[PDB]
Amino acid sequence: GYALTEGEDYLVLDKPIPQEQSGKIEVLEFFGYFCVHCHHFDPLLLKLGKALPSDAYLRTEHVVWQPEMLGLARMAAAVNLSGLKYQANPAVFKAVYEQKIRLENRSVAGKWALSQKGFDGKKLMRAYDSPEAAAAALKMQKLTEQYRIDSTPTVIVGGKYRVIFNNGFDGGVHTIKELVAKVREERKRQT
Numbered sequence: 001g002y003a004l005t006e007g008e009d010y011l012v013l014d015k016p017i018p019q020e021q022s023g024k025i026e027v028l029e030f031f032g033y034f035c036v037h038c039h040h041f042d043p044l045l046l047k048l049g050k051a052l053p054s055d056a057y058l059r060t061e062h063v064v065w066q067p068e069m070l071g072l073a074r075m076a077a078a079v080n081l082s083g084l085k086y087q088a089n090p091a092v093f094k095a096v097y098e099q100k101i102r103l104e105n106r107s108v109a110g111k112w113a114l115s116q117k118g119f120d121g122k123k124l125m126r127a128y129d130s131p132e133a134a135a136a137a138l139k140m141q142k143l144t145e146q147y148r149i150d151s152t153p154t155v156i157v158g159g160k161y162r163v164i165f166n167n168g169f170d171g172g173v174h175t176i177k178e179l180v181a182k183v184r185e186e187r188k189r190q191t
Contacts, residue, residue, distance in 0.1 A: 009163070
């Protein structure tokens with residue numbers, strides 16, 4: 001099978017990241033659109049996300065390490081606020097990592113978004129402009145600094161378990177699935 005041994009598969013965080021929901025097991029991913037490993041790992045992570053039972057969920061946050069790149073953090077806010085994660089991610093990652101398009105810039109984003117064709121780019125920009133998006137951008141920066149996120153992708157399952165990708169990011173999916181099972185059993189009540 002696939003036993004979960006500490007200091008091997010995962011590390012118990014020093015200082016847990018509060019889930020945005022009590023009652024369900026959070027799978028948290030920090031990432032950047034400029035990160036070749038996030039880009040590659042993203043299809044696999046969304047797939048896991050879509051298959052997660054109803055008691056668990058995926059949450060993704062975009063690291064902010066330099067003020068100039070808060071706009072990428074804001075584009076991620078758009079993507080998610082808009083409900084377009086499953087549609088837009090591949091395209092967004094592509095534009096940023098493969099095409100070096102500067103989506104942190106607003107004129108550029110809006111243009112790219114509306115030039116798109118595989119999802120409602122209009123919707124995306126409605127959300128990108130929403131004041132809720134800027135607020136989420138700042139919370140993302142806050143999250144980065146507050147919890148010392150110095151590498152992407154960082155996956156914390158259930159607030160208190162940090163994934164160690166000792167056999168590749170591809171190998172971490174079936175570790176994340178086990179961490180949710182671990183938190184579930186930790187949550188579960190008796191008689």
